[PDB]
Motif scaffolding. Structure first.
Motif, PDB file in Angstrom:
ATOM      1  N   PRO A 102       0.804  -1.230   0.000  1.00  0.00           N
ATOM      2  CA  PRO A 102       0.000   0.000   0.000  1.00  0.00           C
ATOM      3  C   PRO A 102       0.828   1.266   0.000  1.00  0.00           C
ATOM      4  CG  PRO A 102      -0.112  -1.105   2.126  1.00  0.00           C
ATOM      5  CD  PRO A 102       0.528  -2.064   1.181  1.00  0.00           C
ATOM      6  N   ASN A 103       2.069   1.222   0.489  1.00  0.00           N
ATOM      7  CA  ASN A 103       2.881   2.429   0.453  1.00  0.00           C
ATOM      8  C   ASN A 103       3.376   2.754  -0.948  1.00  0.00           C
ATOM      9  OD1 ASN A 103       2.727   3.452   3.110  1.00  0.00           O
ATOM     10  ND2 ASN A 103       4.179   1.893   3.823  1.00  0.00           N
ATOM     11  N   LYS A 104       3.390   1.773  -1.853  1.00  0.00           N
ATOM     12  CA  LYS A 104       3.775   2.013  -3.237  1.00  0.00           C
ATOM     13  C   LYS A 104       2.608   2.487  -4.094  1.00  0.00           C
ATOM     14  N   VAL A 105       1.408   1.940  -3.872  1.00  0.00           N
ATOM     15  CA  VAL A 105       0.276   2.227  -4.752  1.00  0.00           C
ATOM     16  C   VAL A 105      -0.614   3.370  -4.266  1.00  0.00           C
ATOM     17  CG1 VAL A 105       0.328  -0.085  -5.743  1.00  0.00           C
ATOM     18  CG2 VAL A 105      -1.172   0.402  -3.810  1.00  0.00           C
ATOM     19  N   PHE A 106      -0.607   3.678  -2.972  1.00  0.00           N
ATOM     20  CA  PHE A 106      -1.422   4.752  -2.402  1.00  0.00           C
ATOM     21  C   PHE A 106      -0.470   5.860  -1.969  1.00  0.00           C
ATOM     22  CE2 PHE A 106      -3.928   0.850  -1.116  1.00  0.00           C
ATOM     23  CZ  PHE A 106      -4.867   0.979  -2.130  1.00  0.00           C
ATOM     24  N   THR A 107      -0.278   6.847  -2.838  1.00  0.00           N
ATOM     25  CA  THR A 107       0.710   7.893  -2.608  1.00  0.00           C
ATOM     26  C   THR A 107       0.091   9.211  -2.172  1.00  0.00           C
ATOM     27  OG1 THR A 107       0.725   8.381  -4.976  1.00  0.00           O
ATOM     28  CG2 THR A 107       2.395   6.833  -4.146  1.00  0.00           C
ATOM     29  N   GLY A 108      -1.216   9.229  -1.928  1.00  0.00           N
ATOM     30  CA  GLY A 108      -1.914  10.368  -1.363  1.00  0.00           C
ATOM     31  C   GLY A 108      -2.802   9.904  -0.225  1.00  0.00           C
ATOM     32  N   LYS A 109      -3.988  10.504  -0.138  1.00  0.00           N
ATOM     33  CA  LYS A 109      -4.962  10.105   0.865  1.00  0.00           C
ATOM     34  C   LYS A 109      -5.892   9.031   0.320  1.00  0.00           C
ATOM     35  CE  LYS A 109      -3.305  13.223   3.515  1.00  0.00           C
ATOM     36  NZ  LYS A 109      -1.846  12.959   3.689  1.00  0.00           N
ATOM     37  N   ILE A 110      -6.580   8.375   1.246  1.00  0.00           N
ATOM     38  CA  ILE A 110      -7.590   7.369   0.946  1.00  0.00           C
ATOM     39  C   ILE A 110      -8.860   7.783   1.680  1.00  0.00           C
ATOM     40  CG2 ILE A 110      -8.253   4.945   1.158  1.00  0.00           C
ATOM     41  CD1 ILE A 110      -5.267   4.298   1.370  1.00  0.00           C
ATOM     42  N   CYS A 111      -9.916   8.093   0.932  1.00  0.00           N
ATOM     43  CA  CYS A 111     -11.176   8.558   1.499  1.00  0.00           C
ATOM     44  C   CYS A 111     -12.202   7.440   1.616  1.00  0.00           C
ATOM     45  CB  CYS A 111     -11.774   9.654   0.620  1.00  0.00           C
ATOM     46  SG  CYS A 111     -13.017  10.626   1.475  1.00  0.00           S
ATOM     47  N   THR A 112     -12.743   7.248   2.819  1.00  0.00           N
ATOM     48  CA  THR A 112     -13.845   6.299   3.000  1.00  0.00           C
ATOM     49  C   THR A 112     -14.646   6.693   4.237  1.00  0.00           C
ATOM     50  OG1 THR A 112     -14.484   3.958   2.858  1.00  0.00           O
ATOM     51  CG2 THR A 112     -12.670   4.502   4.327  1.00  0.00           C
ATOM     52  N   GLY A 113     -15.690   5.918   4.544  1.00  0.00           N
ATOM     53  CA  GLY A 113     -16.426   6.154   5.772  1.00  0.00           C
ATOM     54  C   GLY A 113     -15.601   5.848   7.009  1.00  0.00           C
ATOM     55  N   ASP A 114     -15.984   6.473   8.126  1.00  0.00           N
ATOM     56  CA  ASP A 114     -15.328   6.198   9.399  1.00  0.00           C
ATOM     57  C   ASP A 114     -15.256   4.698   9.649  1.00  0.00           C
ATOM     58  OD1 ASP A 114     -15.474   5.524  12.434  1.00  0.00           O
ATOM     59  OD2 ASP A 114     -14.663   7.543  12.414  1.00  0.00           O
ATOM     60  N   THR A 115     -14.045   4.206   9.893  1.00  0.00           N
ATOM     61  CA  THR A 115     -13.836   2.767   9.944  1.00  0.00           C
ATOM     62  C   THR A 115     -14.385   2.129  11.203  1.00  0.00           C
ATOM     63  OG1 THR A 115     -11.605   3.055  10.880  1.00  0.00           O
ATOM     64  CG2 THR A 115     -11.836   2.910   8.476  1.00  0.00           C
ATOM     65  N   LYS A 116     -14.771   2.925  12.208  1.00  0.00           N
ATOM     66  CA  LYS A 116     -15.344   2.368  13.422  1.00  0.00           C
ATOM     67  C   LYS A 116     -16.851   2.234  13.331  1.00  0.00           C
ATOM     68  N   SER A 117     -17.497   3.040  12.490  1.00  0.00           N
ATOM     69  CA  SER A 117     -18.950   3.150  12.593  1.00  0.00           C
ATOM     70  C   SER A 117     -19.707   3.074  11.272  1.00  0.00           C
ATOM     71  CB  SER A 117     -19.328   4.445  13.330  1.00  0.00           C
ATOM     72  OG  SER A 117     -18.808   5.577  12.657  1.00  0.00           O
ATOM     73  N   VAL A 118     -19.187   3.663  10.201  1.00  0.00           N
ATOM     74  CA  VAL A 118     -19.934   3.689   8.939  1.00  0.00           C
ATOM     75  C   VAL A 118     -19.740   2.349   8.236  1.00  0.00           C
ATOM     76  CG1 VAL A 118     -20.235   4.852   6.735  1.00  0.00           C
ATOM     77  CG2 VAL A 118     -19.614   6.168   8.774  1.00  0.00           C
ATOM     78  N   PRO A 119     -20.813   1.682   7.774  1.00  0.00           N
ATOM     79  CA  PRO A 119     -20.624   0.351   7.158  1.00  0.00           C
ATOM     80  C   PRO A 119     -19.507   0.275   6.130  1.00  0.00           C
ATOM     81  CG  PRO A 119     -22.936   0.692   7.581  1.00  0.00           C
ATOM     82  CD  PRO A 119     -22.244   2.000   7.956  1.00  0.00           C
ATOM     83  N   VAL A 120     -19.437   1.210   5.182  1.00  0.00           N
ATOM     84  CA  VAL A 120     -18.427   1.088   4.129  1.00  0.00           C
ATOM     85  C   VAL A 120     -17.030   1.098   4.728  1.00  0.00           C
ATOM     86  CG1 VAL A 120     -18.247   3.536   3.523  1.00  0.00           C
ATOM     87  CG2 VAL A 120     -17.740   1.774   1.796  1.00  0.00           C
ATOM     88  N   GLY A 121     -16.826   1.909   5.770  1.00  0.00           N
ATOM     89  CA  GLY A 121     -15.531   1.956   6.434  1.00  0.00           C
ATOM     90  C   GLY A 121     -15.234   0.718   7.261  1.00  0.00           C
ATOM     91  N   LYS A 122     -16.261   0.143   7.892  1.00  0.00           N
ATOM     92  CA  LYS A 122     -16.073  -1.106   8.627  1.00  0.00           C
ATOM     93  C   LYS A 122     -15.691  -2.244   7.688  1.00  0.00           C
ATOM     94  CE  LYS A 122     -19.368  -1.736  11.821  1.00  0.00           C
ATOM     95  NZ  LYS A 122     -20.837  -2.053  11.808  1.00  0.00           N
ATOM     96  N   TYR A 123     -16.363  -2.347   6.539  1.00  0.00           N
ATOM     97  CA  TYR A 123     -15.987  -3.349   5.548  1.00  0.00           C
ATOM     98  C   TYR A 123     -14.564  -3.108   5.059  1.00  0.00           C
ATOM     99  CZ  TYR A 123     -21.021  -4.514   4.952  1.00  0.00           C
ATOM    100  OH  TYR A 123     -22.346  -4.899   5.111  1.00  0.00           O
ATOM    101  N   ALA A 124     -14.218  -1.838   4.824  1.00  0.00           N
ATOM    102  CA  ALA A 124     -12.872  -1.516   4.366  1.00  0.00           C
ATOM    103  C   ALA A 124     -11.827  -1.919   5.400  1.00  0.00           C
ATOM    104  CB  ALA A 124     -12.774  -0.029   4.040  1.00  0.00           C
ATOM    105  N   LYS A 125     -12.078  -1.625   6.680  1.00  0.00           N
ATOM    106  CA  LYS A 125     -11.118  -1.999   7.718  1.00  0.00           C
ATOM    107  C   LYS A 125     -10.952  -3.511   7.813  1.00  0.00           C
ATOM    108  CE  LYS A 125      -9.983  -1.283  12.565  1.00  0.00           C
ATOM    109  NZ  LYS A 125      -8.712  -1.921  12.170  1.00  0.00           N
ATOM    110  N   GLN A 126     -12.051  -4.266   7.672  1.00  0.00           N
ATOM    111  CA  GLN A 126     -11.939  -5.723   7.626  1.00  0.00           C
ATOM    112  C   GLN A 126     -10.994  -6.149   6.512  1.00  0.00           C
ATOM    113  OE1 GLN A 126     -16.019  -7.051   7.203  1.00  0.00           O
ATOM    114  NE2 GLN A 126     -16.109  -7.749   9.332  1.00  0.00           N
ATOM    115  N   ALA A 127     -11.158  -5.556   5.329  1.00  0.00           N
ATOM    116  CA  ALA A 127     -10.333  -5.926   4.188  1.00  0.00           C
ATOM    117  C   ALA A 127      -8.878  -5.551   4.413  1.00  0.00           C
ATOM    118  CB  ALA A 127     -10.854  -5.272   2.917  1.00  0.00           C
ATOM    119  N   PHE A 128      -8.620  -4.339   4.912  1.00  0.00           N
ATOM    120  CA  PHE A 128      -7.232  -3.969   5.183  1.00  0.00           C
ATOM    121  C   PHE A 128      -6.582  -4.912   6.182  1.00  0.00           C
ATOM    122  CE2 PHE A 128      -8.083  -0.551   2.653  1.00  0.00           C
ATOM    123  CZ  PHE A 128      -8.793   0.471   3.231  1.00  0.00           C
ATOM    124  N   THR A 129      -7.307  -5.286   7.235  1.00  0.00           N
ATOM    125  CA  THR A 129      -6.751  -6.202   8.221  1.00  0.00           C
ATOM    126  C   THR A 129      -6.462  -7.558   7.592  1.00  0.00           C
ATOM    127  OG1 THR A 129      -7.916  -5.038   9.989  1.00  0.00           O
ATOM    128  CG2 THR A 129      -7.159  -7.278  10.448  1.00  0.00           C
TER     129      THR A 129
END
Ligand code: MOO
Length: 227
Positions: A102-129
């Motif tokens: 991810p440090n090679k391909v994401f060279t700016g910010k990454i925008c999503t829902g709050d990873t603790k509470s918003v569904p899209v962000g919770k799904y994203a955090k699951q995937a990152f983990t």
């Protein structure tokens, strides 16, 4: 009147269905869209929603544990997929695989829902983990209170990458898909539909959302219909 609170990813589909229903019935349909978290907490605090559609199981379980929806008054309605997006004109192709750095391909910010509470962000955090990316992803995050706020940040070119649902990417001509998360990186994206207030008009709209007519609208927008 029937008041429907729905996850922001459902904005376009539910708006279309509200207009269809109003042409077919002498009923006014009031809609409110926000993150599923915000909507559930508002209902818990007394907001007069008749129907709630969440972008995950968790926020419907949250209401069920508080006795605000019965187990027999909810059904799993829709599925979705999780995607990476970029602004149109800054296209990328990124494989959501542990081998990718991810440090090679994401060279700016990454925008999503709050990873603790918003569904899209919770799904994203699951995937990152699952991918082993979390501690490299987290310092890059810009977090929003619903998926459509994140979509708009990317559409305006204010963030180089976003994480939204497949249906959000399809609705915006200003963003392109940079990668699709494999299903095995996160819990299935499931939208439960819940009947919060049990009355004649609300029960009719709850059934209408499961109808053959409604299936056509949801599929048009790219949702899957759950078995
Ligand atoms: O509740 Mo949403 O549709 O992940 O913003």
């Amino acid at each position: 009147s029937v008041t429907v609170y729905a996850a922001a990813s459902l904005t376009n589909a539910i708006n279309d269905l509200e207009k269809i229903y109003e042409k077919q019935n002498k009923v006014e349909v009031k809609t409110s869209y926000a993150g599923s978290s915000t909507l559930a907490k508002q209902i818990e605090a007394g907001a007069p929603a008749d129907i709630f559609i969440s972008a995950d199981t968790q926020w419907m379980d949250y209401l069920q544990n508080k006795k605000l929806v019965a187990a027999n008054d909810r059904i799993n309605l829709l599925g979705n997929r999780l995607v990476l997006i970029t602004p149109k004109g800054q296209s990328l192709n990124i494989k959501l695989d542990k081998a990718t750095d991810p440090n090679k391909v994401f060279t700016g910010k990454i925008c999503t829902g709050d990873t603790k509470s918003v569904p899209v962000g919770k799904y994203a955090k699951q995937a990152f983990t699952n991918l082993g990316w979390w501690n490299r992803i987290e310092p890059k995050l810009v977090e929003t209170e619903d998926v459509r706020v994140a979509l708009n940040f990317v559409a305006r070119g204010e963030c180089q990458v976003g994480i939204v649902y497949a249906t959000d990417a399809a609705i915006s001509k200003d963003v392109k898909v940079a990668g699709i998360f494999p299903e095995n990186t996160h819990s299935p994206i499931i939208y439960p539909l819940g009947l919060i207030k049990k009355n004649s008009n609300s029960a009719k709209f709850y059934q209408f959302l499961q109808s053959n007519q409604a299936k056509a609208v949801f599929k048009k927008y790219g949702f899957s219909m759950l078995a």
